[PDB]
Symmetry: D2
């Protein structure tokens, strides 16, 4: 039987009303007993928060612990139970810091376990089947939600409330899991996990990266406050294909000239924030984030800034990962 | 032939009438001359990422003047795609007419291979003159689709099919000029709007904040220092803030700056009675909009109230 | 408290004087706080077994119930496979503005994370909501309110399998909170010209699946079986293969109505594209899908077989 | 410069008013392509794609195989009608014995149209065809700035320029003013890895497709059997469910040695094994994550070497 550790970052995603190693994981196994037949489950309570309270300190603790567990010959896979709000940021961060080909599966629930028609039991059961599947090896970190397997690079929460809120808008799901039957149809061709250049093993604090939301009649004062608070990087969630308002652009130009990395993304939801469009990135000293979203671009810029603030090197990073 | 005015806000979206850029549109798409008697005016000459409240107010007041004219049957506005959704939503609540108002643009420049501007503009004229377009509210016509201004958004950076109505869908189609409606909005618009910008010179300042893990107080604080009258928070999932940011928004709301919760996710309602105690913190839930349109509705709300309850009713109505 | 009748067409989708409805109320007791529920069993079949006899029995019973002053709405529990056809049929045969809600479950009641309980609870909330009056027949699934005209099952297994690919949902229902954002502008229900009150059997209408190297033998077999109408699910914008076209032209000349739809899944099968409908004697189904176009053609054939009159029906409803 | 052949299956997809006149007219309409590649042209067929047949698929697959076996040929681009592009692309995806790019491209608007999509689609297709990352991606459809794997592609809309979709996955890449990026690749075997070889085949097996609905019939199953169908695709209700009368005729078909493969009318998702239909008892195949028209192509290929239920289920569970 495969040995799998469930790391809980918060409360139970499945069941309600109630020795693996963490009381939350004991309550999951009691609520979804079918998972005991699939894997020998150990549990740990890695953090004790809602995903809207996530911090870089928790991301570092989680990455280091996932790396320690998957370095163990006895451990086949890790499943992380996670709040849906920021699951895509944690998954993306682990996709570039986990140094293993063994499966890492993040899973959550859009409805509380106490709800009518709670999604957590099926999502967790499916997650365990994905974690133990031979084809999950070397797929990178995945999100399993609503019978779908999403590449961490591509995944996002695209809806506030729907059980089907997770999407991969620039690709689509890489696979399906239906009552535990796992089938992959595609795999990412963007480097992840072992192929990532990033190493957070010695890092205690990630670089500060702010995100700004672009609109008509925009401002310089939020760029200025990010600079004053010691931002190392700024993601600009631009209008359309990463376009700033002029007052904001002038402040971003000043930020870039001071050595703060300015990375253009978009508020729109999907598509690439492309190079050689309307913004003169080379003159103004900006990076184009291409086919990500602001919150995942922030994670990649945080990781980039652990070893470079050079525009050309960071553009290569955005054009590679 | 019906009389329609085309208001340009930038350059040509494709390729006498009273504006050289509209004359160029007519040269580029001469079939439109058989559909309508076209007059042209140049309201601004900017990319839509340069839009300001000043240009929104100038455009809305001029649309209101034109549609009050007995001879004028509809207005078409050519607009950059990046912020077309905000201008359309603003006009949807400030235009006091049932006559058609159609916004149109082009995801590819007029000089491009397979430029989308010619067909978009030709389809927009057909929608503007169609009998069924009356009392549909302001509409965006793109990629053979008719989108209610309330619902419409640019959802992709480059695709010719970048416009969508993620919470509904298109209200109709226009295919080589053939116009068909299948649905209509049941949210009040145009003539049924309470807002009146006829003597407004400047709109209230409303900032937008982008939420993420390890979020900050310093952008709330900078918005307050700059005289924000409202803040849209583009929250994580169902409008959730990071704690440090929440505490700064609570301070902002106690100071009498309206805080309205939206979402960064892209679709769905930022709901009341979820994980945020809006009544205790003094916030508004923006429900089924997006941050950029929620900002437009809060800017209009603030022209007549800063009361949390009154503004929640505005979000739960429009 | 409002009085609602639940009509069951199969078993229980979750977990009065119908045992199946009693089991629903046992499975989702919160519904008893929302409404006084009466229950009837109209059929006891999977939706892949549906027939025109069951559609007619259901429509006439819905009409009787909604004519009662005491009855505020009807909810019908239905298999997902053919819910869109039943909903569309009722949308043109229910002579009332009172809410008619179809609901089902993509996962059996016995499954982990069964969707039936929340779907049914949401369906009752929609059925009793003031704003649901005169919206036409709706499908309520996965927190979404879909117009019967526009609704289709688009996925084999997903709980989010229902969609309105040419519009979108007309509203939402989240933990019982009901909000409409749009309504259909196509006439329905009380405004429908159709009347099935004394109809015992619907006209036969076959559906053909177009592809390269297509055949005439399925057209020919539909004709031999007494088809009154044929829906052709054509390639792209309703295009037939030549051999098939020739057989359809023959079918139309014989007085069997040929209506062009598409296999693609969304969009209009338009007039004035590559097929000369007027010369070949065909109808273009426009913005439907083959399974709903079959329903509208079956109802059309209750009053006419005239190509012009049937085109107007497709261009109206 | 890279040498690419354009095979035209019909008229010009771009423009209005070498080796084939249609390709000469494409190059006159989109001259930027001459900067990218040395283009040769051939007129392989002269039809709208609604008139496609297995004879034309065989001709096309054999000619693509000959051209890609040429050391100097980098890639083939095939201009094709949108209606049945997905069927031709899926057929080539299992019969082209090469990793060199094969790109199918078309236009949802005629080249004479306002805002014709052909010029940019064709320009993009040439950039995909000459991209080194396009090697061993399988046969692809390039439409509307998107790169779709042939296995996953379908036309999902009647008229939209964005009518192409990959509903079970998503596009494998993007091409935006010629800039080619891949994000994913199919993990299902294709092209050089496929077991099928049509080199000796002059005629493909007959496979009919049936459209399921309430109050369904047996007479279309019966007519397919009488016409000598070797296979039937059943486009079932929901997860591939038949009406009972139709199921009884399909069971008779299967007993008579005609292969019955269950698909779905719905548009997306898997027609799964071990659902409500007892496939092993009734002698049916479940087509899983395809659609009826692509399931037809795979069944036609399967029938060139076997009619065994178990072997054909393995084919559908593999490709």
């Amino acid at each position: 039987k495969p040995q799998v550790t469930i790391l809980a970052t918060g409360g139970t995603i499945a069941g309600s009303g109630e020795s693996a190693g963490a009381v939350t994981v004991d309550k999951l196994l009691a609520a979804v007993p079918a998972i005991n037949d699939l894997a020998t489950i150990k549990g740990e309570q890695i953090s004790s928060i809602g995903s809207q309270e996530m911090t870089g300190k928790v991301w570092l603790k989680l990455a280091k612990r996932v790396n320690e567990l998957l370095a163990q010959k006895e451990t086949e896979a890790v499943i992380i139970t996670h709040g849906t709000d920021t699951m895509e940021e944690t998954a993306f961060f682990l996709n570039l810091t986990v140094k293993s080909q063994k499966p890492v599966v993040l899973v959550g629930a859009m409805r509380p376990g106490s709800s009518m028609s709670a999604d957590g039991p099926m999502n967790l059961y499916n997650a365990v089947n994905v974690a133990i599947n031979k084809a999950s090896t070397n797929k990178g970190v995945v999100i399993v939600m609503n019978d779908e397997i999403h590449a961490a690079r591509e995944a996002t929460k695209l809806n506030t409330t729907a059980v089907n809120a997770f999407a991969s808008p620039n690709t689509g799901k890489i696979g399906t899991v239906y009552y535990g039957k796992v089938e992959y149809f595609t795999q990412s061709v963007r480097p992840h996990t072992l192929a990532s250049e990033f190493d957070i093993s010695k890092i205690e604090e990630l670089p500060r990266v702010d995100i700004l939301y672009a609109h008509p009649d925009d401002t310089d004062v939020l760029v200025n406050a990010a600079l004053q608070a010691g931002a190392k990087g700024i993601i600009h969630a631009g209008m359309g294909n990463g376009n700033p308002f002029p007052l904001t652009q002038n402040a971003l130009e000043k930020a870039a000239k001071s050595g703060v990395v300015v990375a253009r993304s978009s508020r729109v939801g999907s598509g690439s924030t492309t190079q050689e469009a309307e913004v003169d990135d080379k003159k103004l000293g900006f990076v184009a984030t291409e086919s990500l979203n602001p919150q995942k671009a922030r994670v990649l810029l945080m990781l980039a800034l652990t070893k470079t603030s050079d525009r050309e090197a960071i553009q290569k990073i955005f054009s590679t990962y």
